[PDB]
């Protein structure tokens, strides 16, 4: 009936993690990006971000009602207590999860990995990203497995800025030969407001406000008609 605040916070985190994994393993094909659980007085509203929304709701909201019902009967909420929505994501091109799923479903049919990886990289760059790198490791026929990597732009690896400037996605692709793991890293651009990128700039980047052209006479003289 009651548990301590440490246990409560840990349980909330576990609930978020398991919910995220559940609707990752269900509808990875539906362009699902991530979940966000919102607190509301005596309520738990859930927002799902996906690139494709007609396919997560489906016809007559079938998929939504089914998976809402199973989340209800799973996570111990009272009868009719869970209501999740499905809204599009404003940043589809530079979300790591979405691009990882895009690559995994470009590769699941059976296709050349270089063309798909370059297409994903080009699409992320044309989405305004500051830089990307895609690593695909696994079997390419033979007695040995190789890892080929596609980079373009500029990217950071160390320090704290990598926590809020780079988003990473690691996904497994199951082929008949075996499993190849893909890794999509996107370096978000700096943008105040809009939630497209982090608010703070790179801590090693110093800005100066730029003056304008000044070609003026020696002394100001008033002019009247």
């Amino acid at each position: 009936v009651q548990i301590s605040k440490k246990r409560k916070f840990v349980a909330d985190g576990i609930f978020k993690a398991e919910l995220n994994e559940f609707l990752t393993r269900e509808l990875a094909e539906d362009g699902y990006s991530g979940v966000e659980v919102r607190v509301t007085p005596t309520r738990t509203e859930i927002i799902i971000l996906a690139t494709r929304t007609q396919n997560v709701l489906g016809e007559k909201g079938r998929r939504i009602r089914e998976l809402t019902a199973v989340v209800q009967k799973r996570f111990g909420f009272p009868e009719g207590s869970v209501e999740l929505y499905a809204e599009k994501v404003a940043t589809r091109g530079l979300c790591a999860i979405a691009q990882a799923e895009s690559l995994r479903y470009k590769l699941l049919g059976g296709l050349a990995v270089r063309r798909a990886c370059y297409g994903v990289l080009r699409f992320i760059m044309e989405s305004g990203a500051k830089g990307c790198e895609v690593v695909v490791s696994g079997k390419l026929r033979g007695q040995r497995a190789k890892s080929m990597k596609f980079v373009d732009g500029l990217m950071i690896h160390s320090g704290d800025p990598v926590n809020y400037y780079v988003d990473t996605a690691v996904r497994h692709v199951l082929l008949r030969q075996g499993v190849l793991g893909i890794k999509v890293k996107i370096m978000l651009p700096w943008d105040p407001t809009g939630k497209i990128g982090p608010k703070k700039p790179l801590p090693d980047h110093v800005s100066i406000v730029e003056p304008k052209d000044e070609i003026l006479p020696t002394t100001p003289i008033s002019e009247q008609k």
Binding site: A112, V113, R114, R115, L140, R141, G142, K146, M148
Partner: peptide, 30 residues
């Protein structure tokens, strides 16, 4: 099967010669 990818991967294996031939077919009338 990407002829360029096959060349970049295993040009230095038992199949390097045949992979080179498949690459030359994709590029020109080789």
């Amino acid at each position: 099967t990407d002829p360029i990818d096959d060349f970049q991967v295993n040009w230095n294996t038992k199949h390097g010669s045949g992979v080179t031939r498949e690459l030359m077919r994709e590029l020109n009338g080789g």
